[PDB]
Ligand binder design. Structure first.
Ligand SMILES: NS(=O)(=O)c1cc2c(cc1Cl)N[C@H]([C@H]1C[C@H]3C=C[C@@H]1C3)NS2(=O)=O
Ligand SMILES: NS(=O)(=O)c1cc2c(cc1Cl)N[C@H]([C@H]1C[C@H]3C=C[C@@H]1C3)NS2(=O)=O
Lengths: 49, 49, 49
């Protein structure tokens, strides 16, 4: 997730935001706050809380 | 974007999901939920009588 | 759908390809061959046959 007041995305987000990692095939959830910094394909498996 | 739709079209996602969730039915109720035992009456059943 | 041997999209997808429409809020299923001519958003409702 992002940091408060500095927007530092850690974790698997910042690996793609900050140019570290090239692609991420992983259980990652399409949100609203993630489309602004990275892009997602069409979803391949559905779920819920 | 064009690649994941091929796997959705040709059921490869279904095959992988079956392999990694349904072929490894291990614990209890999934396997033994459709079997039958006849009976043997013990005293714990009939006590209030 | 496309016509046999001519690749002429009738229906609503042709209305987006041939410049006659602008957007199509509709019960429209994301297939493979519809991706190569017109863009889709993320899915909003899931179903099956
Ligand atoms: N039954 S499931 O959760 O494993 C599952 C879920 C999905 C699959 C395929 C499977 Cl097998 N592909 C769909 C895609 C197909 C087309 C329609 C939406 C997307 C495009 N997304 S999905 O709805 O996320
Ligand atoms: N239960 S459903 O088919 O009506 C349905 C199906 C979908 C919904 C919302 C609903 Cl209510 N939104 C999802 C999107 C929302 C976010 C999370 C995945 C995608 C992004 N697409 S979806 O999986 O197509």
């Amino acid at each position: 997730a992002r940091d408060a007041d500095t927007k530092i995305w850690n974790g698997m987000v910042g690996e793609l935001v900050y140019g570290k990692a090239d692609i991420a095939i992983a259980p990652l959830t399409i949100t609203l706050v993630r489309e602004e910094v990275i892009d997602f394909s069409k979803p391949f498996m559905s779920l819920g809380i | 974007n064009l690649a994941v739709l091929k796997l959705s079209e040709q059921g490869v996602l279904d095959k992988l999901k079956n392999k990694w969730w349904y072929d490894k039915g291990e614990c209890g109720a999934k396997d033994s939920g459709s079997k039958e035992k006849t009976s043997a009456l013990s005293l714990s059943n009939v006590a209030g009588v």
